């Protein structure tokens, strides 16, 4: 079993317990660390924080405590944007010029792979010929990385992929079957379901249907989205379960109406940490007084509420049921967005540190021994 964490290099600004230092990373916490993000400039791999070097150095230095660890630079995210990715993809010297820099730079920094997180090819402004380009993006990258291993001598690069659950992204963006042979695993985003861009409430990341859900909707969850991309070919072994540490926030139209599928006005207000409207990290969640938490039946996870503020989040329940249907699924994992938004310094939860990802790792047996 895998599990794969994310770190983010923007956590470090947070104020307060809330700032996510070098410290607080945990070498024996998860099997693969992937750091969140690197960009793109001339078509080549770059860092995009002022001390990127240096926090480099410090998370690859995670594997001289446990040198079983492996970690990755991930490329792309949510607010990169596409334009440099379909500029670089559009040729094949642009790729070759990428590619190249990529072998480069993780060898120079010492990161054993890749995570691609483009958001996403053939959406979100980048055109439908993104989507072959893509799968030729990730077999140049795959063969490039084998031949580098074989001129070298060294183990072999990893590549993965951060990959959508929505089958509007899937279809306009992912030759499932094709890439899923070039991936080493696929780190799939099951999450983000449901959220304040929605005018009712619903769930960041159910683990099923409500009963009263009907066409598209039926498929915004998480065992929708693992089949889907079990179906279109992924290997069940490289498929990694995607889980939040986060939810998703609301604010209702009225305090008396607090279902899920209630009308909603907007984002949550924003949390006294993440300061970001309509996220809440776990630990702006798991200790809110005065609130009322309630279970979504069908779908098998928390909700939260107090006044006119409503929260879909994860907790220790629901991580465990979502490591028994990976289980079940035969998944290669659990993959965790995002450590710094777990109770990572055991100040809020009373459940001490990293509550959430200890609960995947001992779901998974991955306990150190
Ligand atoms: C999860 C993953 O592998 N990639 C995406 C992330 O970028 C995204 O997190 C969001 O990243 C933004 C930077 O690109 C941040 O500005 C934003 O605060 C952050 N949001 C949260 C809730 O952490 C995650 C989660 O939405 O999903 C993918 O879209």
Known sequence: ??????????????????????????????????????????????????????????????????????????????????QKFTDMVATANNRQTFVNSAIRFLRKYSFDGLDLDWEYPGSQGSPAVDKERFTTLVQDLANAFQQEAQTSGKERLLLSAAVPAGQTYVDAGYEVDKIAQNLDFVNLMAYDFHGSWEKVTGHNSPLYKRQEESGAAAS????????????????????????????????????????????????????????????????????????????????????????????????????????????????????????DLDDFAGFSCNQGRYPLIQTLRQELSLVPR
């Open 220 to 339: 915004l969850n998480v065992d929708a989205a693992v089949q889907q991309w079990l179906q279109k070919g992924t290997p069940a072994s490289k498929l990694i379960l995607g889980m939040p540490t986060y939810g998703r926030s609301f604010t209702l139209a009225s305090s008396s109406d607090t279902r899920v599928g209630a009308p909603a006005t907007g984002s949550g207000t924003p949390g006294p940490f993440t300061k970001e409207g309509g996220m809440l990290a776990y630990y702006e969640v798991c200790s809110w007084k005065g609130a009322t938490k309630q279970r979504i039946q069908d779908q098998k996870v928390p909700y939260i509420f107090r006044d006119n503020q409503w929260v879909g989040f994860d907790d220790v329940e629901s991580f465990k049921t979502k490591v028994s249907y990976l289980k079940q699924k035969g998944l290669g994992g659990a993959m965790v967005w995002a450590l």
């Open 1 to 82: 079993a895998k599990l794969v964490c994310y770190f983010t290099n923007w956590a470090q600004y947070r104020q307060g317990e809330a700032r996510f230092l070098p410290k607080d990373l945990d070498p024996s916490l998860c099997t693969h660390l992937i750091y969140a993000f690197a960009g793109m400039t001339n078509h080549q791999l770059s860092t995009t924080e002022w001390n990127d070097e240096t926090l480099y150095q410090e998370f690859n230095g995670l594997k001289k405590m446990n040198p079983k660890l492996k970690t990755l630079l991930a490329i792309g995210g949510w607010n990169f944007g596409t």
